[PDB]
Amino acid sequence: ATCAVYGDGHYLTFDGQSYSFNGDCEYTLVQNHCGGKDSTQDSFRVVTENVPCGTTGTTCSKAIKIFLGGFELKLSHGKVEVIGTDESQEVPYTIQQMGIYLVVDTDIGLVLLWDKKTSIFINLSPEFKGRVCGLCGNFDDIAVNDFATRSRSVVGDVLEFGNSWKLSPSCPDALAPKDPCTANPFRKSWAQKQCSILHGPTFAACHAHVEPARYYEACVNDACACDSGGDCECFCTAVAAYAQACHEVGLCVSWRTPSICPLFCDYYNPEGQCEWHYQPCGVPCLRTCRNPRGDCLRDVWGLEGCYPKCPPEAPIFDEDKMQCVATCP
Amino acid sequence: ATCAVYGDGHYLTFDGQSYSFNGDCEYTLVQNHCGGKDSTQDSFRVVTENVPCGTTGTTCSKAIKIFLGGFELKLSHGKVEVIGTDESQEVPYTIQQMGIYLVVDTDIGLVLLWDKKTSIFINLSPEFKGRVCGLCGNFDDIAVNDFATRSRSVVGDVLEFGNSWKLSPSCPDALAPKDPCTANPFRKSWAQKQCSILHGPTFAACHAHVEPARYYEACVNDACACDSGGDCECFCTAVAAYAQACHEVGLCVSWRTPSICPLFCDYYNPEGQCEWHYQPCGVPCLRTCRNPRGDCLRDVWGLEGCYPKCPPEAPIFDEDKMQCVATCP
Ligand SMILES: [Ca+2]
Ligand SMILES: [Ca+2]
């Protein structure tokens, strides 16, 4: 159970519902109290804005704003921005970047994952079941009642469900998308050649467990649509979505190849030093000044991305100068 | 003095002449005896074929064939293929891959550099001056007489000069190219943003020496034209052309950034081992079973690409399993 918003309008609910829509507006994914009685009076809210990326019109998210007790977080250009420093209580969120994921976790039990480019995953702890409303549907493990359109009513119109959670009072109404591959037929051969890796023998373990046909067509559509420049990032995000979906099951897999989506972990390594090896499965509990060896958050998973390989001498990471120091003074 | 064929129809002669043309045919760059008296009776010849890469019609080279004493080399799909094993004399060429360059050298003194995708550079030793004919012009350090169109005549028509060196008797005549950026105006902003790095402070050392305006517009044109997919490779080749042109002067520079054209030298490193650090300047003389420490070819330059960093124990490279073994048994 985890919200899966990625690429161009691909969504997967907690209860396991897959739909699609595109719209250039502001939307909220997770709300507290559903606008009613404030039971826990926390009023958590996560919102996002879509920009017309790509000439096909298939917009993708650009910025994410998080509201928590009068505290606001702005995510844009790969840098975290905070607006509003309430002089009460304290900081309730932790900002941590792991691999190619930007992770923010709340003391309430809310965990968000950010690829810093397009994708985003939201998971909810079981104590908040049912009483959550948004585009991700009610967290009740029932794919039937996940279409509550701000009025406790389930409607078969995915477009109506998506439009019901717009934020700007004066914002253009979203509409059904076109066919990216029919729009760009000349890219179809290259797109199929690139996205065929998912059905290749490398991902056979996940193929034997889940059905990647939806993710396969998602990769094809994303590659077809991405035509204004930098299609490599579109393809990499499309693949990494299914990679994470397989990883969260529990069985680690490896899919990176120097010809496709190549990381450059050597760059962070300074001169005369080599302590950054890519970890496919995902690093276990680490040690650093902020998070000691004995302390770790197990709600996170292996994920992916370059991680430092600190020497046995000074294995603690610093997180301020991106190196392994013995201890932060 | 070095032939510089790269991207989509970009050529620079030994004597320093820059022109451009595109054509889907077979052409010869360097010929021996110019079809006349065989002085050294070596009859060296390098030929190439152009394929309609990209929807703009700007073709780029795909395969290179080398003729040397009845020995033929086929270069396609990133793998070297040899056709014709004469049962006389011996092998006169050495096939070696260094960094992101595939290098073949002849005992005569001919050196070729291959990026395995599009680009190619040809240098000539001084003993072969003047008596060489081809698209690269006569090797006499004179930009005036480099337009010999197979008849010892210089013609101001670059198109005519290019067509005069076609090989297939029945092959379509080449024509002047269009404007890639006018063809794809929506890509102009992204292309300028990507190609502006050359004029950025990183390459100021070469900016203070050579004039990169031609290379700047070449990068812009290449990024504009590359639209059928994989524009990242087009941009990377366009940048690396100027990078090599600056490197051959003598002053080493660094331009790689994990956000742009990122190498994945970590991949070659096996588990528990980190002995592949990217070298910007280019590795000095190496040691291996084929080429010992005392033996090295100094005609080559630093170039670029991932190189192994063998430990002080077993520093010899094997070249058969891509690792550093003590000595080949
Ligand atoms: Ca539901
Ligand atoms: Ca000349």
Numbering used by the authors:
A (entry chain B), B (entry chain A): 901 to 1229
What does the paper say about this structure?
The two gel-forming mucins MUC5AC and MUC5B constitute the main structural components of the mucus protecting the underlying epithelia in the respiratory system. We determined the cryoEM structures of the wild type D3 assembly of the human MUC5AC mucin and the structural single nucleotide polymorphisms (SNP) variants Arg996Gln and Arg1201Trp that affect intermolecular interactions. The D3 assembly forms covalent dimers that can appear in two alternative conformations, open and closed, where the closed conformation dimers interact through an arginine-rich loop in the TIL3 domain to form tetramers.
We produced recombinant proteins with each variant separate as well as with both arginines replaced. The general appearance of the dimers is essentially identical. In the double mutant, the effect of the Arg996Gln mutation is more pronounced, bringing the VWD3 and the TIL3 domain closest together. The double mutant shows that once Arg996 is mutated, Trp1201 stabilizes the interface bringing TIL3 closer to VWD3. The double mutant Arg996Gln Arg1201Trp showed a ratio of 96:4 confirming the effect of the mutations. Even though no major rearrangements were found, both SNPs can affect the equilibrium between the dimer open and closed conformation. A high prevalence of double mutants is not observed except in Finnish population, where both mutants are present independently in 10.9% and 23.9%.
